Coordinates of N, CA, C and O in Angstrom, one line a residue:
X3 N -4.9 20.4 4.2 CA -5.3 18.7 3.8 C -4.8 18.4 2.4 O -4.5 19.3 1.5
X4 N -4.4 17.2 1.8 CA -3.7 17.1 0.7 C -4.7 16.9 -0.6 O -5.9 16.6 -0.3
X5 N -4.0 16.8 -1.5 CA -4.8 16.6 -2.6 C -3.7 15.2 -3.6 O -2.9 15.4 -4.0
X6 N -5.0 14.2 -4.0 CA -4.3 13.3 -4.6 C -5.1 13.1 -5.8 O -5.8 13.4 -6.1
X7 N -4.1 12.2 -6.8 CA -5.0 12.2 -8.2 C -5.5 10.8 -8.2 O -6.2 10.8 -9.1
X8 N -5.6 10.3 -7.2 CA -6.3 8.6 -7.0 C -7.4 8.8 -6.0 O -8.1 8.3 -5.9
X9 N -6.8 9.7 -4.9 CA -8.1 9.5 -3.5 C -8.8 11.1 -3.9 O -8.4 12.0 -3.7
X10 N -10.3 10.4 -3.8 CA -11.1 12.0 -3.7 C -11.1 12.1 -2.0 O -10.5 11.5 -1.2
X11 N -11.6 13.5 -1.8 CA -11.8 14.2 -0.4 C -12.3 12.7 0.3 O -11.4 12.7 1.4
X12 N -13.4 12.5 0.3 CA -14.1 11.5 1.0 C -12.9 10.3 1.3 O -13.1 9.7 2.5
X13 N -12.5 9.4 0.6 CA -11.6 8.4 0.6 C -10.2 9.0 1.4 O -10.1 8.3 2.5
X14 N -9.8 10.2 1.4 CA -8.8 10.6 2.5 C -9.3 10.8 3.6 O -8.5 10.3 4.6
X15 N -10.2 11.2 3.8 CA -11.0 11.5 5.1 C -11.3 9.9 5.7 O -10.7 10.0 6.9
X16 N -11.8 8.8 5.1 CA -12.4 7.7 5.7 C -10.8 7.1 5.9 O -10.6 6.3 7.2
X17 N -10.1 7.4 4.9 CA -8.4 6.5 5.6 C -7.8 7.4 6.8 O -7.0 6.5 7.5
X18 N -7.8 8.5 6.8 CA -7.0 9.2 7.8 C -7.7 9.1 9.2 O -7.0 8.8 10.3
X19 N -8.8 8.7 9.2 CA -9.5 8.5 10.5 C -9.2 7.1 10.9 O -9.1 6.3 12.4
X20 N -8.1 6.4 10.0 CA -8.0 5.0 10.6 C -6.2 4.8 10.7 O -5.9 3.6 11.1
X21 N -5.6 5.9 10.3 CA -4.4 6.0 11.0 C -4.3 5.5 12.0 O -5.2 6.2 13.0
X22 N -3.0 5.1 12.9 CA -2.7 4.9 14.0 C -2.3 6.4 14.5 O -2.0 7.5 14.0
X23 N -2.4 6.3 16.1 CA -2.0 7.4 16.7 C -0.8 8.2 16.4 O -0.6 9.5 16.3
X24 N -0.1 7.2 16.5 CA 1.5 7.4 15.8 C 1.6 8.8 14.4 O 2.3 9.7 14.8
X25 N 0.7 8.7 13.6 CA 0.5 9.9 12.6 C -0.7 10.9 12.9 O -0.8 11.2 11.4
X26 N -1.7 10.4 13.3 CA -2.7 11.3 13.4 C -2.7 13.1 13.6 O -1.7 13.0 14.6
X27 N -3.1 13.3 12.7 CA -2.6 14.8 12.7 C -1.8 15.2 11.8 O -1.7 16.6 11.6
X28 N -1.0 14.3 11.7 CA 0.2 14.6 10.9 C 0.0 14.6 9.1 O -0.9 14.4 8.5
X29 N 0.6 16.1 8.5 CA 0.8 16.4 7.3 C 0.7 15.3 6.3 O 1.6 14.4 6.6
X30 N 0.1 14.9 5.2 CA 0.4 14.0 4.2 C 1.7 14.9 3.2 O 1.3 15.8 2.4
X31 N 2.7 14.0 3.0 CA 3.6 14.4 2.0 C 3.8 13.5 0.6 O 3.9 12.4 1.1
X32 N 3.7 13.8 -0.6 CA 3.7 12.5 -1.6 C 5.0 12.2 -1.6 O 5.7 13.2 -2.4
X33 N 5.7 11.0 -2.0 CA 7.2 10.8 -1.8 C 7.2 10.2 -3.1 O 7.9 10.3 -4.0
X34 N 6.1 9.3 -3.5 CA 6.6 8.5 -4.5 C 5.2 8.6 -5.4 O 4.2 8.0 -4.7
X35 N 5.1 9.0 -6.8 CA 4.2 8.8 -7.5 C 4.4 8.8 -9.1 O 5.3 8.9 -9.9
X36 N 3.5 7.3 -9.7 CA 3.9 6.7 -10.8 C 3.2 7.8 -11.8 O 3.7 8.0 -13.1
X37 N 2.6 9.1 -11.4 CA 2.2 10.2 -12.4 C 3.2 11.2 -12.3 O 3.5 11.7 -13.5
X38 N 4.0 10.9 -11.8 CA 5.3 11.9 -11.4 C 7.0 11.5 -11.6 O 7.4 12.4 -12.0
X39 N 6.8 10.5 -11.2 CA 8.0 9.7 -11.3 C 8.0 8.7 -12.4 O 7.0 8.4 -13.1
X40 N 9.1 7.8 -12.7 CA 9.1 7.0 -13.6 C 8.6 6.2 -12.8 O 8.3 5.6 -11.6
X41 N 8.2 5.1 -13.8 CA 6.7 3.9 -13.2 C 8.0 2.4 -13.2 O 8.3 1.7 -14.3
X42 N 8.5 2.3 -11.9 CA 9.2 1.1 -11.7 C 9.1 0.8 -9.8 O 9.2 2.2 -9.5
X43 N 9.5 -0.3 -9.6 CA 9.5 -0.4 -8.3 C 11.0 0.1 -7.8 O 11.2 0.5 -6.6
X44 N 12.1 0.1 -8.6 CA 13.1 0.7 -8.1 C 13.3 2.4 -7.9 O 13.9 2.7 -7.1
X45 N 12.6 2.6 -9.4 CA 12.3 4.3 -9.0 C 11.5 4.4 -6.9 O 11.9 5.2 -6.5
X46 N 10.4 3.8 -7.2 CA 9.9 3.7 -5.4 C 10.7 3.3 -4.6 O 10.7 4.0 -3.5
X47 N 11.8 2.6 -4.6 CA 12.8 2.0 -3.6 C 13.6 3.5 -3.3 O 13.7 4.0 -2.1
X48 N 14.2 4.6 -4.4 CA 14.9 4.9 -4.3 C 14.1 6.5 -3.6 O 14.6 7.2 -3.0
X49 N 12.6 6.8 -4.3 CA 12.4 7.8 -3.6 C 11.9 7.7 -2.1 O 11.5 8.3 -1.3
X50 N 11.8 6.4 -1.9 CA 11.4 5.9 -0.2 C 12.8 6.0 0.7 O 12.5 6.0 2.0
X51 N 14.1 6.0 -0.2 CA 15.2 5.8 0.6 C 15.4 7.1 1.8 O 16.2 7.2 2.7
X52 N 14.7 7.9 1.7 CA 15.3 9.0 2.6 C 14.3 9.8 3.7 O 14.0 10.3 4.2
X53 N 13.1 8.6 3.7 CA 11.9 8.8 4.4 C 11.8 8.5 5.7 O 12.5 6.9 5.9
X54 N 11.6 8.9 6.5 CA 11.9 8.6 8.1 C 10.3 8.8 8.7 O 10.1 9.7 9.9
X55 N 9.5 7.8 8.4 CA 8.4 7.7 8.1 C 7.5 6.3 8.1 O 8.0 5.8 7.0
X56 N 6.5 5.8 9.0 CA 5.6 5.0 8.1 C 4.9 5.6 7.0 O 5.0 7.1 6.3
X57 N 4.4 4.8 5.7 CA 4.2 5.2 4.7 C 2.6 4.7 4.6 O 2.2 3.5 4.8
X58 N 2.0 5.6 3.6 CA 0.5 5.3 2.9 C 0.8 4.7 1.3 O 1.0 5.6 0.6
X59 N 0.2 3.6 0.9 CA 0.3 3.1 -0.7 C -0.9 3.3 -0.7 O -1.9 2.9 -0.3
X60 N -1.0 3.6 -2.0 CA -2.6 3.9 -2.6 C -2.2 3.9 -4.1 O -1.2 4.1 -4.6
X61 N -3.3 2.5 -4.1 CA -3.0 1.7 -5.8 C -4.6 2.2 -6.5 O -5.8 1.8 -5.9
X62 N -4.3 2.5 -7.7 CA -5.5 2.5 -8.5 C -5.3 1.5 -9.6 O -4.6 1.5 -10.0
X63 N -6.5 0.2 -9.6 CA -6.1 -0.4 -10.6 C -6.8 -0.4 -12.0 O -7.6 1.1 -11.8
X64 N -7.1 -1.0 -13.1 CA -7.2 -0.3 -14.6 C -8.9 -0.7 -14.4 O -9.3 0.0 -15.3
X65 N -9.5 -1.0 -13.2 CA -10.9 -1.1 -13.3 C -11.3 0.1 -12.1 O -12.3 0.4 -11.8
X66 N -10.5 1.0 -11.9 CA -10.3 2.2 -11.3 C -10.9 1.9 -9.7 O -11.3 3.1 -9.1
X67 N -10.7 0.9 -9.2 CA -10.9 0.4 -7.9 C -9.4 0.8 -7.1 O -8.5 1.0 -7.4
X68 N -9.6 1.1 -5.6 CA -8.5 1.9 -4.8 C -8.5 0.9 -3.8 O -9.3 0.7 -3.1
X69 N -7.4 0.7 -3.5 CA -6.9 -0.2 -2.3 C -5.4 0.4 -2.1 O -4.8 0.6 -2.9
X70 N -4.7 -0.7 -0.8 CA -3.4 -0.4 -0.9 C -3.6 -0.9 0.7 O -3.4 -1.9 1.3
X71 N -2.1 -0.1 1.2 CA -1.7 -0.6 2.6 C -1.3 0.8 3.3 O -0.7 1.8 2.9
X72 N -1.2 0.6 4.6 CA -0.4 1.3 5.5 C 0.6 0.6 6.2 O 0.5 -0.4 6.7
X73 N 2.2 1.0 6.1 CA 3.4 0.6 6.4 C 4.0 1.1 7.7 O 4.1 2.0 6.9
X74 N 4.3 0.3 8.3 CA 5.1 1.1 9.5 C 6.4 1.5 9.5 O 6.9 2.1 9.6
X75 N 7.1 1.1 7.6 CA 8.5 1.3 7.5 C 8.3 1.7 6.3 O 7.3 0.9 5.2
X76 N 9.2 2.5 5.4 CA 9.2 2.8 4.5 C 9.9 1.6 3.5 O 10.3 0.9 4.1
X77 N 9.1 1.8 2.2 CA 9.3 0.3 1.1 C 10.9 0.2 0.7 O 11.6 1.8 0.3
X78 N 11.5 -0.8 1.0 CA 13.0 -0.8 1.2 C 13.2 -2.2 0.5 O 12.5 -3.4 0.8
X79 N 14.2 -2.4 -0.3 CA 14.9 -3.9 -0.7 C 14.8 -4.8 0.7 O 15.9 -3.7 1.5
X80 N 14.9 -5.6 0.6 CA 15.3 -6.7 1.5 C 15.5 -7.9 1.4 O 14.7 -8.6 0.4
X81 N 15.9 -8.7 2.2 CA 15.9 -10.1 2.2 C 15.3 -11.2 3.0 O 15.4 -12.3 3.0
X82 N 14.4 -10.2 4.1 CA 13.8 -11.3 4.7 C 12.7 -10.3 5.2 O 12.2 -8.9 4.9
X83 N 11.2 -10.8 5.6 CA 10.3 -9.8 5.5 C 10.5 -8.8 6.9 O 11.5 -8.6 7.9
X84 N 9.9 -7.6 6.8 CA 10.0 -6.5 7.9 C 8.6 -5.5 7.7 O 7.4 -6.1 7.7
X85 N 8.8 -5.0 8.9 CA 7.3 -4.3 9.1 C 7.1 -4.8 10.5 O 7.3 -5.7 11.0
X86 N 6.2 -4.0 10.8 CA 5.6 -4.4 12.4 C 3.9 -4.2 12.4 O 3.3 -3.9 11.4
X87 N 3.4 -4.7 13.8 CA 1.9 -4.7 13.8 C 1.0 -3.5 13.9 O 0.0 -4.3 13.6
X88 N 1.3 -2.4 13.4 CA 0.5 -1.6 12.9 C 0.3 -1.3 11.4 O -0.5 -0.7 10.9
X89 N 1.0 -2.1 10.6 CA 0.8 -2.2 9.2 C -0.9 -3.2 9.1 O -0.9 -3.7 9.7
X90 N -1.5 -2.5 7.9 CA -2.5 -2.7 7.5 C -2.7 -2.6 6.1 O -2.5 -1.8 5.7
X91 N -3.6 -3.8 5.5 CA -4.4 -3.5 4.3 C -5.9 -2.8 4.0 O -6.5 -2.8 5.0
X92 N -6.1 -2.0 3.4 CA -7.6 -1.6 3.2 C -7.8 -1.6 1.5 O -7.0 -1.8 0.6
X93 N -8.9 -1.3 1.5 CA -10.1 -1.3 0.1 C -11.0 -0.7 0.0 O -11.5 -0.2 1.3
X94 N -11.3 0.1 -0.8 CA -12.7 0.9 -1.0 C -13.6 0.1 -2.1 O -14.6 0.7 -2.1
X95 N -13.2 -1.2 -2.4 CA -14.0 -2.3 -3.2 C -14.7 -3.4 -2.8 O -13.6 -4.0 -2.4
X96 N -15.9 -3.5 -2.6 CA -17.0 -2.8 -2.8 C -17.2 -1.8 -1.8 O -17.7 -0.6 -2.2
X97 N -16.5 -1.6 -0.5 CA -17.0 -0.4 0.0 C -15.5 -0.5 1.1 O -14.5 -1.1 0.9
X98 N -15.8 0.7 1.7 CA -14.0 1.0 2.6 C -14.0 -0.1 3.5 O -14.9 -0.3 4.5
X99 N -13.1 -0.9 3.5 CA -12.7 -1.9 4.5 C -11.2 -2.3 5.1 O -10.2 -1.8 4.1
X100 N -11.0 -2.0 6.2 CA -9.6 -2.1 6.7 C -9.3 -3.8 7.1 O -10.3 -4.1 7.9
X101 N -7.9 -4.1 6.9 CA -7.7 -5.5 7.3 C -6.7 -5.4 8.3 O -5.0 -5.1 7.8
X102 N -6.9 -5.4 9.7 CA -5.7 -5.3 10.2 C -4.9 -6.6 10.7 O -5.3 -7.6 10.2
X103 N -3.8 -6.6 11.6 CA -2.9 -7.5 11.7 C -3.8 -8.6 12.1 O -4.5 -8.2 13.4
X104 N -3.6 -9.8 12.0 CA -4.3 -11.0 12.9 C -3.8 -11.4 13.7 O -4.2 -12.3 14.7
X105 N -2.4 -11.4 13.9 CA -1.8 -11.8 15.3 C -1.2 -13.2 14.7 O 0.0 -13.7 15.4
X106 N -1.4 -13.5 13.4 CA -1.1 -15.0 13.1 C 0.2 -15.2 12.8 O 1.1 -16.5 12.7
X107 N 0.8 -14.1 11.9 CA 2.3 -14.1 11.5 C 2.7 -12.6 11.5 O 1.7 -11.4 11.4
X108 N 4.1 -12.5 11.1 CA 4.6 -11.2 11.0 C 5.1 -10.7 9.7 O 6.1 -10.4 9.7
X109 N 4.8 -11.6 8.4 CA 4.9 -11.3 7.2 C 4.5 -9.9 6.5 O 3.9 -10.0 5.6
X110 N 4.9 -9.0 7.3 CA 4.0 -7.9 7.0 C 4.6 -7.3 5.6 O 3.6 -6.9 5.0
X111 N 5.7 -7.0 5.4 CA 6.3 -6.4 4.2 C 8.0 -7.2 3.4 O 8.4 -7.5 4.2
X112 N 7.8 -7.4 2.3 CA 9.1 -7.5 1.6 C 9.4 -7.0 0.4 O 8.5 -7.3 -0.5
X113 N 10.3 -6.4 0.2 CA 11.0 -5.9 -1.1 C 12.2 -6.8 -1.4 O 13.1 -6.4 -1.0
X114 N 11.6 -7.4 -2.4 CA 12.6 -8.2 -3.5 C 13.0 -7.0 -4.4 O 12.7 -6.2 -4.8
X115 N 14.0 -7.7 -5.3 CA 14.5 -7.2 -6.3 C 13.4 -7.0 -7.6 O 13.1 -5.7 -8.4
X116 N 12.2 -7.8 -7.5 CA 11.2 -8.1 -8.7 C 9.9 -8.0 -8.2 O 9.3 -8.0 -9.2
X117 N 10.0 -7.4 -6.8 CA 8.3 -7.2 -6.7 C 8.4 -6.9 -5.1 O 9.5 -6.8 -4.6
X118 N 7.2 -6.4 -5.1 CA 7.1 -5.8 -3.7 C 5.8 -6.3 -3.2 O 4.7 -6.1 -3.8
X119 N 6.0 -7.0 -1.9 CA 4.7 -7.9 -1.6 C 4.5 -7.5 0.3 O 5.3 -7.1 0.9
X120 N 3.3 -7.5 0.6 CA 2.7 -7.6 1.8 C 1.8 -8.4 2.4 O 1.1 -9.0 1.3
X121 N 2.0 -9.4 3.1 CA 1.6 -10.3 4.0 C 2.2 -11.4 3.1 O 2.9 -11.4 2.4
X122 N 1.9 -12.6 4.4 CA 2.6 -14.0 3.8 C 2.0 -15.4 4.6 O 0.8 -15.3 5.1
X123 N 2.6 -16.3 4.3 CA 1.7 -17.7 4.7 C 1.3 -18.6 3.9 O 1.3 -17.9 2.7
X125 N 1.6 -19.9 0.2 CA 2.3 -18.7 -1.0 C 1.4 -17.9 -1.2 O 1.8 -17.3 -2.3
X126 N 0.6 -17.4 -0.8 CA -0.3 -16.3 -0.7 C 0.2 -14.9 -0.2 O 0.9 -14.7 0.9
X127 N 0.2 -13.7 -1.2 CA 0.1 -12.4 -0.4 C -0.6 -11.9 -0.5 O -1.6 -11.5 -1.4
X128 N -1.2 -11.2 0.4 CA -2.1 -10.0 0.8 C -2.0 -8.9 -0.4 O -3.0 -9.0 -1.3
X129 N -0.7 -8.8 -0.7 CA -0.6 -7.6 -1.9 C 0.7 -7.7 -2.5 O 2.1 -8.2 -2.1
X130 N 0.7 -7.7 -4.0 CA 1.7 -8.2 -4.4 C 1.9 -7.1 -6.0 O 1.0 -7.2 -6.7
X131 N 3.5 -6.6 -6.1 CA 3.5 -5.7 -7.3 C 4.6 -6.0 -7.6 O 5.6 -6.5 -7.6
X132 N 4.7 -6.0 -9.3 CA 5.9 -6.6 -10.0 C 6.5 -5.3 -10.4 O 6.8 -4.3 -9.5
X133 N 7.7 -5.4 -10.8 CA 8.9 -4.8 -10.5 C 8.9 -3.5 -11.9 O 9.3 -2.4 -11.6
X134 N 8.1 -3.4 -12.7 CA 7.6 -2.6 -13.3 C 6.3 -1.9 -12.5 O 5.7 -0.6 -13.4
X135 N 5.6 -2.5 -11.4 CA 4.6 -1.7 -10.8 C 3.1 -1.5 -12.1 O 2.8 -0.9 -12.1
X136 N 3.3 -2.9 -12.3 CA 2.4 -3.1 -13.8 C 1.4 -4.4 -13.4 O 0.2 -4.0 -12.8
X137 N 2.0 -5.3 -13.4 CA 0.9 -6.7 -12.8 C 1.2 -6.4 -11.3 O 1.7 -6.4 -10.5
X138 N 0.0 -6.4 -10.7 CA -0.6 -6.7 -9.4 C -1.2 -8.2 -9.2 O -1.7 -8.5 -9.8
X139 N -1.3 -8.5 -7.7 CA -2.2 -9.8 -7.2 C -2.8 -9.3 -6.0 O -1.7 -8.8 -5.1
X140 N -3.9 -9.5 -5.4 CA -4.1 -9.7 -4.2 C -4.9 -11.1 -3.5 O -5.8 -11.4 -4.3
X141 N -4.1 -12.0 -2.8 CA -4.8 -13.1 -2.1 C -5.2 -12.5 -0.7 O -4.8 -11.9 -0.1
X142 N -6.6 -13.4 -0.1 CA -6.3 -13.3 1.3 C -5.3 -14.5 1.7 O -4.6 -15.3 1.4
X143 N -4.6 -13.6 3.1 CA -3.7 -14.2 3.6 C -3.7 -13.8 5.0 O -4.7 -13.2 5.5
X144 N -3.0 -15.1 5.9 CA -2.8 -14.9 7.1 C -2.6 -13.7 8.1 O -3.0 -13.5 9.1
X145 N -1.7 -12.6 7.4 CA -1.0 -12.2 8.1 C -2.3 -10.6 8.3 O -2.2 -10.2 9.8
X146 N -3.2 -10.7 7.7 CA -4.0 -9.6 7.7 C -5.7 -10.2 7.5 O -6.5 -9.4 7.8
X147 N -5.7 -11.6 7.4 CA -7.4 -12.3 7.0 C -7.8 -11.2 6.4 O -9.1 -11.0 6.5
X148 N -7.4 -10.6 5.1 CA -7.8 -9.7 4.2 C -9.1 -10.2 3.2 O -8.5 -11.4 2.7
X149 N -9.5 -9.4 2.5 CA -10.2 -9.9 1.2 C -9.7 -9.8 0.5 O -8.5 -8.7 0.2
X150 N -9.6 -10.2 -1.0 CA -9.1 -9.9 -2.3 C -9.0 -8.0 -2.4 O -10.3 -7.8 -2.3
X151 N -8.0 -7.6 -2.6 CA -8.4 -6.5 -2.2 C -8.8 -5.6 -3.6 O -9.9 -4.5 -3.7
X152 N -9.0 -6.0 -4.7 CA -9.3 -5.7 -6.1 C -10.4 -7.0 -6.1 O -10.5 -7.4 -5.6
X153 N -10.6 -6.5 -7.6 CA -11.9 -7.4 -7.7 C -11.7 -8.7 -8.1 O -12.5 -9.4 -7.5
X154 N -11.2 -9.3 -8.8 CA -10.6 -10.8 -8.8 C -8.6 -10.7 -8.0 O -8.5 -9.6 -8.1
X155 N -8.4 -11.5 -7.9 CA -7.1 -12.1 -7.8 C -5.9 -11.1 -8.3 O -5.2 -10.4 -7.6
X156 N -5.9 -11.1 -9.8 CA -5.4 -10.6 -10.9 C -5.5 -9.1 -11.0 O -6.7 -8.9 -11.4
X157 N -4.7 -8.3 -11.5 CA -4.9 -6.7 -11.4 C -3.9 -6.0 -12.3 O -2.7 -7.0 -12.3
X158 N -4.1 -4.7 -13.0 CA -3.0 -3.9 -13.6 C -2.9 -2.7 -12.5 O -4.2 -2.1 -12.8
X159 N -2.1 -2.5 -12.2 CA -2.0 -1.1 -11.8 C -2.2 -0.3 -13.0 O -1.5 0.3 -14.0
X160 N -3.2 0.8 -12.5 CA -3.3 2.2 -13.7 C -2.1 3.2 -12.9 O -2.0 3.5 -14.0
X161 N -2.0 3.7 -11.9 CA -1.4 4.5 -11.3 C -1.2 3.9 -9.6 O -2.4 3.6 -9.1
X162 N -0.1 4.6 -8.9 CA 0.1 4.6 -7.9 C 0.8 5.5 -6.8 O 1.3 6.4 -7.5
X163 N 0.8 5.8 -5.6 CA 1.1 6.9 -4.8 C 1.7 6.2 -3.4 O 1.0 5.4 -3.0
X164 N 2.8 6.8 -2.5 CA 3.4 6.6 -1.6 C 3.3 7.7 -0.7 O 4.0 8.9 -1.5
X165 N 2.8 8.1 0.2 CA 2.5 9.4 0.8 C 3.2 8.9 2.4 O 3.6 7.9 2.5
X166 N 4.3 10.1 2.7 CA 4.9 10.0 3.9 C 4.0 11.2 4.9 O 3.1 11.7 4.6
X167 N 4.7 10.8 6.1 CA 4.4 11.7 7.2 C 5.1 12.7 7.9 O 4.8 13.7 8.8
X168 N 6.6 12.6 7.0 CA 7.7 13.5 7.6 C 7.9 14.6 6.8 O 6.7 15.0 5.7

């Protein structure tokens, strides 16, 4: 079993039970960490470039709340949305909750030069700036999610991207 600087053992177990069958039982491998690597979206893209695997995004904001996404595709720069229906958002605040694909649109993942976002329909379920510093979470139609953080706007304390290959 893995050790995360952000997820306690109980959180890892709750998340692992919600992963799709595609990666059930697969060991977790830490591909990008703001604690270990340069803190920037560019570094995240570069550390994701060799991944042959769906990925698990783990964010801890400056209020110590934990939330993120399971994405069917490694995070990459794009000029249109990508990802498919197994992508979901999750949060642990106030309690562990998963927001699966609603079927309403397929705006799962978009990697801009200056931001990474999941969800669409002008709200993003999850948005991170180019420094992985400012973030935002809104209810969006892709996932019909709750605001993943306390309020809409948050600050990343640290984040991790795990892979299964």
